[PDB]
Amino acid sequence: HIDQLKEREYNNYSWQDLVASGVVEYIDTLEEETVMLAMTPDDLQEKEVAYCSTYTHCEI
Amino acid sequence: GNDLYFVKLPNFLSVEPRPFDPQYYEDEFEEEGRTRLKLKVENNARIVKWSDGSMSLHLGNEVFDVYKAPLQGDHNHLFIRQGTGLQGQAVFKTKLTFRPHSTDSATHRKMTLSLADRCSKTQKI
Amino acid sequence: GFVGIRFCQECNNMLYPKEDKENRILLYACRNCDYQQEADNSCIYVNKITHEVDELTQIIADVSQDPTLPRTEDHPCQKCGHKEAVFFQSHSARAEDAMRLYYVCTAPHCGHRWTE
Ligand SMILES: [Zn+2]
Ligand SMILES: [Zn+2]
């Protein structure tokens, strides 16, 4: 996705392809109640003593 | 001879399921009418492959620009089911673990008429 | 314990408690109906002032599939013997004075819950 999205304009790819490929998702405040949300990709999804180990989403 | 050769296209890019033949083609169709005729004067196909791993689908000098994105709700087998055998003789081929993500587009137009009319009539006498 | 609502048999209405004068027994009559049925409980109305509630009766087993809910491997189940369990506090209004935790076994077709 980063490779297709870096090469946008030089090809037709866009944000809506991340949506359509199921990579990113619009989450409502009322649905944000139920997410188990990470704050960076790596740093929160590594292996330690466990915080959750059930993350559903990450911040952009 | 077998590879990823399945190709979804939108409504406005609907290619004929059969080769072009003069005995199968007819004149029925006509900004309004501009989009109408395109359905059969364009839509045999050559999916051109590029050094970046993108694909371009050509039915003219117009281009559809394509990526071989994965699929997970549609994990079928593709097969040429021709009516010949017992009840459609499906010949085996590629499995639907990927399908095209790609861009094919349209446009709109503009209008203009009038606002209100005259008034203040008066009968004789 | 408690008393339930016991419904009429004719009108399907709510039965009142009624003492039988001149057999000295406890009945259940109707308002709408003329339906007399014979009590068994000998108990009319109850009231828990302490409001003593066990939370394990309110806990559903469906909690275990909560992504947002901490997971341990230090308390195993007692029926099956699974290692995983989720845990949460009473999650209730009217919690008297307790920060007691509650566990549910994280294994399908079990839904065993316990408190330590
Ligand atoms: Zn009744
Ligand atoms: Zn268990």
Inter-CA distances, A27 with A16, B73, C40, Å: 15, 22, 56
Q: What is the radius of gyration, based on Cα positions, of chain C?
A: 22
Name the strand (E) or helix (H) holding A32: helix A29-32
Residue C67: what residue type?
P
Ligand 1 centroid to residue C60 C-alpha, Å: 35
Q: How was this structure obtained?
A: cryo-EM
C-alpha dihedral (B22, B26, B27, B29), degrees to nearest 10: -130
The whole-angstrom separation of Cα C82 and Cα C106 is: 7
CA A34 to chain C, closest CA, distance in angstroms equals 7
Give the alpha-carbon dihedral of B82, B83, B86, B90, to 10 degrees. 10
Task: Answer whether C69 touches A (CB < 8 Å).
Answer: yes
Handedness of CA A29, A34, A40, A41 (dihedral sign): negative
Within 8 A of B67 by CB-CB distance, chain A residues are 4, 13, 17
Q: Structural domains in chain C?
A: 3-47 (no CATH), 48-116 (2.20.25.10)
- Least CB–CB distance from A20: residue in B52, B54, B101: B101
Q: Which chains touch C (3 or more CB pairs under 8 A)?
A: A
Cβ-Cβ contacts under 8 Å, A8 against chain B: none
Q: What Rg value do the Cα atoms of chain A yield, rounded?
A: 15
Q: Of B78, B75, B76, whose CA–CA distance to B94 is shortest?
A: B78
In units of Å, what resolution does this entry have?
Answer: 3.0
Whether residue C44 contacts residue C31, with contact meaning beta carbons closer than 8 Å, is answered with no
Which contacts of C24-32 are long-range, i.e. CB under 8 A and separated by 24 or more positions? C32/C8
- Cα–Cα distance, A60 to C91 (Å, whole number): 31
